[PDB]
Amino acid sequence: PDNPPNEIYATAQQKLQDGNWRQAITQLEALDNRYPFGPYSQQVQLDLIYAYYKNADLPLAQAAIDRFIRLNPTHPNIDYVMYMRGLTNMALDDSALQGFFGVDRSDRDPQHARAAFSDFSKLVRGYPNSQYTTDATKRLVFLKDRLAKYEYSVAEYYTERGAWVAVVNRVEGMLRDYPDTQATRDALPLMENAYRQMQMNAQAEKVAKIIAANSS
Amino acid sequence: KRQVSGDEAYLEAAPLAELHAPAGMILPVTSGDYAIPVTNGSGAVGKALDIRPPAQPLTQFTGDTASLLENGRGNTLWPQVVSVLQAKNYTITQRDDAGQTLTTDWVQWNRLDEDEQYRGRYQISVKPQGYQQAVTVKLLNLEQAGKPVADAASMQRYSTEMMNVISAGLD
Amino acid sequence: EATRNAAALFSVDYKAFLNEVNNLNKRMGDLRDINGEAGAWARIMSGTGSASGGFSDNYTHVQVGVDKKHELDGLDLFTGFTVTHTDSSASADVFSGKTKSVGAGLYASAMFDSGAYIDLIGKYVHHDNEYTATFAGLGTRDYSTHSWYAGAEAGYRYHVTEDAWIEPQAELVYGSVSGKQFAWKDQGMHLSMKDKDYNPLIGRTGVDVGKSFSGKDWKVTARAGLGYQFDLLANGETVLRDASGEKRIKGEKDSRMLMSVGLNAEIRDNVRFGLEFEKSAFGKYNVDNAVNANFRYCF
Amino acid sequence: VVKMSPLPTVENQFTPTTAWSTSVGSGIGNFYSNLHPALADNVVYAADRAGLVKALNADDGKEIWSVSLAEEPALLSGGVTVSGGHVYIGSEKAQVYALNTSDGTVAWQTKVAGEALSRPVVSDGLVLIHTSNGQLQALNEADGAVKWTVNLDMPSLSLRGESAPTTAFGAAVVGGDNGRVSAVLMEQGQMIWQQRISQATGSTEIDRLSDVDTTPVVVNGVVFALAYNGNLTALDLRSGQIMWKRELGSVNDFIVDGNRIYLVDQNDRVMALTIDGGVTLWTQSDLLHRLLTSPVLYNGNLVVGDSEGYLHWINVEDGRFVAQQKVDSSGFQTEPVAADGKLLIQAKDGTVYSITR
Amino acid sequence: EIQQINIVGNHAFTTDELISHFQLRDEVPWWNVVGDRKYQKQKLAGDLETLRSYYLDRGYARFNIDSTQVSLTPDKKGIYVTVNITEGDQYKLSGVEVSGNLAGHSAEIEQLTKIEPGELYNGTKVTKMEDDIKKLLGRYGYAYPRVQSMPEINDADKTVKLRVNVDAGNRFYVRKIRFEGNDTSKDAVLRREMRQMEGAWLGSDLVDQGKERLNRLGFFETVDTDTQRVPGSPDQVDVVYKVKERNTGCFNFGIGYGTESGVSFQAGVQQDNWLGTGYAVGINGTKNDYQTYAELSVTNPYFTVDGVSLGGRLFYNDFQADDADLSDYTNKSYGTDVTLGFPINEYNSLRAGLGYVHNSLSNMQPQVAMWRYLYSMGEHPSTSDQDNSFKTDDFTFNYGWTYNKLDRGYFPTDGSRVNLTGKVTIPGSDNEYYKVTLDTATYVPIDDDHKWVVLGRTRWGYGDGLGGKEMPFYENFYAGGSSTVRGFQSNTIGPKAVYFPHDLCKSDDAVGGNAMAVASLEFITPTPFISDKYANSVRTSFFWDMGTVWDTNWDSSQYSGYPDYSDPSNIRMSAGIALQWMSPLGPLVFSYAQPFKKYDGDKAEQFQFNIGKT
Amino acid sequence: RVVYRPDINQGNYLTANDVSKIRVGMTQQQVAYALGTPLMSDPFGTNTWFYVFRQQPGHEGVTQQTLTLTFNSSGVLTNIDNKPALSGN
């Protein structure tokens, strides 16, 4: 039932402290939909974000991020919301039984990693003076390495099959977007071999030249 | 709890090292959006970061700001603060200069769990005449918590939240 | 010999009635924890038992059913239909046989806001057995009968805690089964035994405590307790005539006890886990049940 | 369905009995049309839906002739009209029949563009039929010879049972499926004037019928029309002017007493209205939404049917259930006919019943 | 509620058959409740379009809907709908001509456009022409051509000529091929099934075959192709295969602590796709006072990237059934095999391999068939006594041939799958024999909706020894149960052992016949009680089953008193209803079958609950 | 060996008529219009263009044809080169 917001809000933050995400989110949703324009319902929406993230309710977390950013384009705490959106995408990406068996989820679907990289890039470009920028940048590095590994695996397969120009396009895009990764360094030999197999070595000497220059 | 959900595996990421073209050679790499701007550190990484909603004042909270911004007998907050300093917190301000209304409190050890033993600080208060209502600052001092001394944008908001919620209770 | 062997089959028929006897949250599912009055449930079990004289048996019952209803003001009553099939195999001193029974019936339940619930069920089945015994010269024979099983139960759920509820319950059920009459004239002597329609009744009082943790962190619906069952009536009367003379037999009451069950913890939306307990009443009548534990992990 | 159907009260002052029954065959059935017969020299001409048609002798109910016009069924729609020594009929299959009375075989058969819902009418040596499409056609009695096809406009929601035009001073007037009641000079096929008496006094046109499909009645210069959505109007033959208006309407069949005018509301509310101001006299609430038919004057009284097959009688002053009749248990959906001091009511299978007072 | 429909204004066809093709219905037929009688404007327009097609398809080109009217009774309960039309007249297809900047493939279009002269117009074949001409031009890689059709009509000659203009456009190339939705399976397993190679000229047929192969892999509940052009270069198109990964494989566990059996232990996993690696791993085991069974098997379908597969298995079967001596004999069977296979074309695969087996059986119950087998082996033990032991080891070579063309990977709605498995011995083995088995499953639908389908299952098997020998009985065929004749009993059909006295005593149990043949016909229909979302998650079938297994070696002269067993004529026959359900726990079946023509020892079980494989 | 190796195509194809349209001294745009957009270019050093036609019907000798068109860094055709390939294996 409805009552003054004091007791309901106090119980809400108290059970957030206890960590009972179920009852916490039920209470918060009830209070928010009861007072859709309360004095400080924005804090309630932030608590909704936190509850969805910690309760493993990721799609609802993403939807609530989108709703909050649409209703509140400018606020002293946008960086937190965008960081949570990126965290949502990150967490959705990497978690399964391969985590138990330690299988590199590198050549799987990269879409979620791509979206997370986009959101973290938006954040780090936006407010470098915030407090989440360092962890964000570390996540940027990890994600970029991951995408490079995925493209490397695709190129490796296409070489294995014998399609000698799809590999060229793939590794060329890899160079054009991942200039500072291990994957491109390892894929340069794929360039060399592919150019060799086309009877047009003229670019193959250049590939060997750049390989020798950067091999050290 | 209190950290990010995922593992700290990305903390062990490989270094981001670029490559240089040789003589008489060009390189088209600078043609995408996957560029990582260089930024300094001094940020809580790994599980050390405290992901937790930044509780809003419930006005001005840019730094440690705790000024009070519609009331006529707005001076009634000081006896209410005395009531707050009474059984409400059982703690009379360290310098309760009510005549000058500069009732600066003393450092405490209030606790709210969250894997934290205690978190209390001297939320210094002064009551000027600003804005529509009778102004009253809540600028806190150095926050103690379990640490000897420490401060952070969210951390200072935690101690200020205690002054924020209680002062707003008087409404 | 021949007279006692039929009683064991009547006891097996009582055991078949005893096997047909189940709980309220098990035979027809828990009265709570299901939000919709429209829902389908089932009951698959395989029990066993034994008695003095080599009378051992093992039965397997598979039943399904559905119910559909709407809501009301203070009592969300529901009702529906169900089907069942039982198959058992038993052995004795000089007797051994297998029985089966296919039947259809209806179930209903109603729970109040005070935690008290009631349930009822009624089913008609066509039970046919086929057994061989060398005593009395009968040999091998198969006989069929119609069984009308009617049962009622009720329970008082107490909200002891958020994850604990001590819910006493009491039930009473009566069933009508037409008897079979047969003469052993194939061996040379009449030895005719005639069994009439039996309409026994039996009640049961049981005290149990169920702990139902949730959130997939524990997700364990454990249920401990005990119950006592007493046969109110027993109409297993059979009149036998032979060279020595004429004899009459009648059914007997029950004073049986039943123990708790296993864990039955379904953790996540894709996994399962559960167990069952069996009462090894060796001292009383060398009685027993069947116990098992298994779980399924599907990727 | 959740719809109130009040029971009929019991009142009696005289006992009328059925003169005879006919049972022509599978007539109107569950359909809806304007199948009512015509009387000429003590012989009624009943028409059957399945293509049958029978002439019957009055005061005795004796079969004269009966012929079938099967094709396959025929689906007769128009009412029975007689002119010269012939009868004219329209069918739902977009055909028109000219039958030669006693002979039975069609004197001449022609085709029309659309269903002939409109009751056929003869005037000035031409028969006027209004198709269920937005067209009206004048046909010659010799052999077809469509004189003209005057076009009309209508939205795709109009209720059936289209209006029957009436002639006066050489010009025929007819209502429209949107309220545009118009007049046409019936010798060359030119449309003079029209006006919309039906006001769309609602929220959205989907729930608004706002069309007139009942025949107008002319008295000197005054004439009337009745739309489903209401909008009773008195208008004069000279042009599109309105002497007075009323927001009750909601009728599809009405008669005139010379001084008073009767009507049937949608909720089955019957009142008597005056020439000048149209003030109600009384009302009846015994049968609400029971789908009564048109009232007919007879010996200074009114006779009405119903969709329950319970014939009702009404006093000319203040109304009174002088007699209540029960002849069929399935109901009535036809239009009553009175001539030579005799009343006839059509049914589904018993079809025509001639009553005695 | 709708009441009447009329098509007044026609004089060529009857009203009833015209309205028969309408989805909208005006009146319910007597002895059925198949259809409803309401009013819906959108389906009125749809049926109007169908009516337009059903006139234009037979040379009534000069046809147009003059008008359509919907009305209402003055009671708001019954609705009449009328249509007034213009039939026009019959017309004849004068001829066809082609034009445009068509590509050098003009011969194919010209051949495909050929129509028998003297025939009337029909819009259905014309529409087929545009559709399949577009498909043809897409086969060579023109995804976006534009075609126009003009039916010139000469009424004075009752003729209609079609002028079709084709605009091939530009060449098309695929820049990238990106997958989406594969949460677990690695990109390699999806990419290795493709036939439209990245960086080449597009082929629509190649993309279609790729999506078909992804479907046939059998671990994707739904797959949808999508070809979209890049907003960059004028002629470059990206291709995406939006999949939705499903469940596969199960880990199960159980313990059977009980008085009558002591302790029974069961565990095992079986995935056809291990962690997305693409392997297939099945391991399981059980231990009991009567049973000790275990087996392990691993297969890689892509040992090399052409289609070559390599798979092996091992098994230990020392169950040691001793108690009660109920038609059981002490037996330990341990063995292994390894096989490799390769495809011979796009749709047929061969496989071959080698195997070692060893079997030790002691304390065999007496019966004539096994005594004859042992006599053929050269051993002559006592008839009434049961104490002999037999050790044997066998080298063997096995092979197989598979044809697979199925619209989907599991309970499909098209195609056929056949599989032949041959199993011969080789010199150096104690046993000398061979055995050939064959399975076939053909799916044929009845309409393009692919919801109602007929299914034909056939299983055959036969073998024998060579050089005056005979195979061991323990490797003989069996019949009865799911995946076989339904409803009878698990492994109940066949010759029954003849027990020696301990004269001859007949046994209800079977020993399996050397020659087996069964067949089955199934109607498959949707489930009316299942919503749309789960509609493609269950299956209801009506099955008619027949089967027969016998022994081709039966010296009926020596024991002519007992019923003959060398007679294949003793057919069995059953039928019933089967309900296949796919569950988060896996695939389940449910059959309520009533045998029609049954024999002795049937042990009829009208309720079977097989789990797995299905 | 004998196993089914599916057919493989590895670049934009061209014919004799496509080659005959080529003349030295034309701009990038309309030559791309004439021959389609090249799939494999050289962003390394010079901005030359390649047109490779490859066909490997499976267990058959690969057929290759290379058309290398070198352009100045302004947008016009500098020179061309054609090669029926089939050298080596």
Numbering used by the authors:
A (entry chain D): 28 to 243
B (entry chain C): 32 to 89, 97 to 107, 109 to 210
C (entry chain P): 1002 to 1300
D (entry chain B): 29 to 99, 107 to 392
E (entry chain A): 176 to 677, 698 to 809
F (entry chain E): 25 to 113
The paper states:
The structures revealed BamA- EspP- hybrid barrels captured as late stage folding intermediates, as expected. Fully-folded EspP β-barrels that contain the native α-helix in the barrel’s lumen were present in all structures. Hence, we term these as ‘Release Complexes’, in which SurA has returned to a structural ensemble that includes both Extended and Compact states.
Its integrity requires the correct folding and insertion of outer membrane proteins (OMPs) by the membrane-embedded β-barrel assembly machinery (BAM). Unfolded OMPs are delivered to BAM by the periplasmic chaperone SurA, but how SurA and BAM work together to ensure successful OMP delivery and folding remains unclear. The results suggest that SurA binds BAM at its soluble POTRA-1 domain, which may trigger conformational changes in both BAM and SurA that enable transfer of the unfolded OMP to the BAM lateral gate for insertion into the outer membrane.
